[PDB]
Amino acid sequence: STTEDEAKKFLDKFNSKAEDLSYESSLASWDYNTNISDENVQKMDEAGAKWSAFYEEQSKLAKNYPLEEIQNDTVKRQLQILQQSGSPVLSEDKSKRLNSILNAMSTIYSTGKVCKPNNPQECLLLEPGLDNIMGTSKDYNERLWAWEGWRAEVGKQLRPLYEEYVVLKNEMARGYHYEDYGDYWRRDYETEESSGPGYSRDQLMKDVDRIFTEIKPLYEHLHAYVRAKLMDTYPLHISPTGCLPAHLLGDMWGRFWTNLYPLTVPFGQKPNIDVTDAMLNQGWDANRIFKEAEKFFVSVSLPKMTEGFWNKSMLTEPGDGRKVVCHPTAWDLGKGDFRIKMCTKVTMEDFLTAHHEMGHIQYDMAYASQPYLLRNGANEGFHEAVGEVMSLSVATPKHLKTMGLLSPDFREDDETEINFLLKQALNIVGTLPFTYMLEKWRWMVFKGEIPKEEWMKKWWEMKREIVGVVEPVPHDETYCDPASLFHVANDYSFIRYYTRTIFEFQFHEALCRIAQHNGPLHKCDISNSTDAGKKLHQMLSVGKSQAWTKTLEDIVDSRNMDVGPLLRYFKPLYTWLQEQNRKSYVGWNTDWSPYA
Ligand SMILES: *[C@@H]1O[C@H](CO)[C@@H](O[C@@H]2O[C@H](CO)[C@@H](O)[C@H](O)[C@H]2NC(C)=O)[C@H](O)[C@H]1NC(C)=O
Numbered sequence: 103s104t105t106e107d108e109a110k111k112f113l114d115k116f117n118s119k120a121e122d123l124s125y126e127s128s129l130a131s132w133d134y135n136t137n138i139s140d141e142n143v144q145k146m147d148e149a150g151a152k153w154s155a156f157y158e159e160q161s162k163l164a165k166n167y168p169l170e171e172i173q174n175d176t177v178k179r180q181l182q183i184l185q186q187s188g189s190p191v192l193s194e195d196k197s198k199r200l201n202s203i204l205n206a207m208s209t210i211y212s213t214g215k216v217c218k219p220n221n222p223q224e225c226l227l228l229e230p231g232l233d234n235i236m237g238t239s240k241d242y243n244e245r246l247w248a249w250e251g252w253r254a255e256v257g258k259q260l261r262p263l264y265e266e267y268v269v270l271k272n273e274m275a276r277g278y279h280y281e282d283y284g285d286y287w288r289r290d291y292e293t294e295e296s297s298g299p300g301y302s303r304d305q306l307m308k309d310v311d312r313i314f315t316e317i318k319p320l321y322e323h324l325h326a327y328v329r330a331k332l333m334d335t336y337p338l339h340i341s342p343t344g345c346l347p348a349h350l351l352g353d354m355w356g357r358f359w360t361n362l363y364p365l366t367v368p369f370g371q372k373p374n375i376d377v378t379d380a381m382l383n384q385g386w387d388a389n390r391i392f393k394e395a396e397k398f399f400v401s402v403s404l405p406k407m408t409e410g411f412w413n414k415s416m417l418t419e420p421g422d423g424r425k426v427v428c429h430p431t432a433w434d435l436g437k438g439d440f441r442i443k444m445c446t447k448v449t450m451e452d453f454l455t456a457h458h459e460m461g462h463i464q465y466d467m468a469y470a471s472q473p474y475l476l477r478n479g480a481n482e483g484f485h486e487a488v489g490e491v492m493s494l495s496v497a498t499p500k501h502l503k504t505m506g507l508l509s510p511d512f513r514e515d516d517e518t519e520i521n522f523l524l525k526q527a528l529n530i531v532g533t534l535p536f537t538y539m540l541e542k543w544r545w546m547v548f549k550g551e552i553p554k555e556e557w558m559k560k561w562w563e564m565k566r567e568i569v570g571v572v573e574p575v576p577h578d579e580t581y582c583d584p585a586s587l588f589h590v591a592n593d594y595s596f597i598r599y600y601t602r603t604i605f606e607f608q609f610h611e612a613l614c615r616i617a618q619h620n621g622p623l624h625k626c627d628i629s630n631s632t633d634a635g636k637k638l639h640q641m642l643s644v645g646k647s648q649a650w651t652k653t654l655e656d657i658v659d660s661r662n663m664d665v666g667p668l669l670r671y672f673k674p675l676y677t678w679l680q681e682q683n684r685k686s687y688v689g690w691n692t693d694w695s696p697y698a
Pocket residue numbers: 401500501504505629630
């Protein structure tokens with residue numbers, strides 16, 4: 103017979119085995135995460151080792167299958183995603199060296215701490231001490247000391263480890279017939295199967311550069327406004343026409359500017375919308391929050407939650423008989439099992455995180471009939487986008503008013519609108535240049551255009567160009583500041599947090615185009631709409647069987663990355679910032695430095 107039927111039978115056998123194998127592995131990981139002990143860790147390790155061995159064996163048996171002679175799309179994409187394991191391309195010495203380097207970097211990041219001067223015993227860890235310090239303290243010297251200590255503790259020790267890591271990664275990428283590790287990361291967006299506009303790994307960088315250049319005006323206005331607002335609390339630490347200090351962005355690295363909201367609030371006289379008070383007054387619990395989320399989701403013609411999700415997930419902290427580290431995760435155990443692990447409290451942030459997790463669960467249930475290799479999003483930016491569009495549609499005051507959470511006598515004037523827009527921009531807009539510059543620096547380091555003896559010499563250059571922030575103290579070639587982030591020194595991609603921002607606002611407005619919404623975009627509501635829900639479900643059910651460009655154009659009528667919806671959403675805040683910056687300089691000076 104032909105190779106097509108042989109590959110089909112091989113994939114059928116592989117799926118029939120991997121279903122049960124991944125089911126057992128997911129059960130083990132869930133028993134570990136929900137019951138921390140010493141034997142559960144061993145069981146999870148055995149399950150993971152078995153799953154990895156099976157995956158490697160299937161990759162070896164699939165490598166001998168030619169993709170050129172095969173004409174079908176599903177089997178071709180399945181063999182393509184199966185052949186990309188990563189581990190079995192090198193010898194044992196380099197593999198063990200890379201594994202030891204990864205484990206050492208993870209241990210250094212987990213046990214990293216900063217010791218205050220003149221106190222060798224009072225050393226504070228990163229979480230939750232350093233995070234709280236960088237997010238709540240409004241002092242210059244304290245934040246500067248914390249940043250310098252974290253840098254000198256993490257990068258100074260991870261520099262040679264990161265050097266060997268990037269060397270081994272580039273060598274493995276060259277072994278996998280790839281250009282560099284940046285190519286191995288960008289291979290996720292490459293869909294060489296659509297007849298016509300086929301997306302390539304080189305077009306992704308160009309599209310990201312174009313969308314960054316298009317965001318540049320709004321981000322520059324926002325940065326100028328934040329600088330003008332922070333100039334009141336920092337009279338001699340921030341120049342009006344220069345860059346901003348890196349240790350004053352709300353956290354240790356500057357990924358989110360939300361912590362700067364009390365200092366950059368447009369109108370401090372009006373309080374923000376708070377729901378936890380009405381929830382505590384009306385006697386709300388986790389079950390009520392989840393039932394309200396299920397009702398909101400089924401009002402958009404989406405399926406409801408199954409009884410297994412209700413009697414198997416961990417919606418509340420059990421306590422008194424177990425110890426767990428609970429972070430919001432929408433887990434898919436396979437075979438039609440979907441659970442949510444989260445210690446949801448009676449608040450508003452947890453109220454939105456519940457809707458986020460329910461959207462993630464709905465997205466996972468959308469492709470429940472797709473093959474195991476296609477039981478995921480088309481790219482790494484659709485999951486979080488689908489999770490965030492629901493939170494955007496829920497956080498509107500209309501949903502809180504017509505459902506019994508906010509008083510009907512709440513006047514919605516432009517002050518609260520500007521406040522909400524600025525609060526959203528401090529979290530969504532302030533991360534795009536940071537993510538872009540981090541991914542570009544990592545790609546250029548993988549490609550070899552930045553020699554080691556100049557790595558940092560470039561890291562602080564783009565910081566002044568792309569983001570517009572200047573370092574507080576000069577760093578020589580012994581620091582490895584970029585590795586101070588969790589996602590950087592963990593073999594984790596970072597562009598997934600960028601494209602989602604484009605993929606989120608594109609979807610929302612699109613739904614608002616079907617629900618016949620009129621007026622501003624920040625007052626949209628997808629609830630009580632069957633037409634938009636049908637298109638949403640049809641877009642979510644495709645999973646990974648089709649190219650991401652086709653899935654995008656089947657939802658927003660555009661087969662390319664477009665940041666237009668983001669500008670249309672932030673147009674009110676854009677005009678407000680343009681009117682406010684009439685007495686301030688827009689832009690930053692690349693040559694200015696705080697230490698002169
Ligand atoms: C979706 O529509 C339904 C019905 O049109 C809304 O439900 C009503 O809420 C009012 C009070 O605001 C009650 O008096 C009605 O009895 C409710 N009807 C039903 C059938 O329950 C619902 O609030 C709408 N949802 C949103 C988010 O606007």
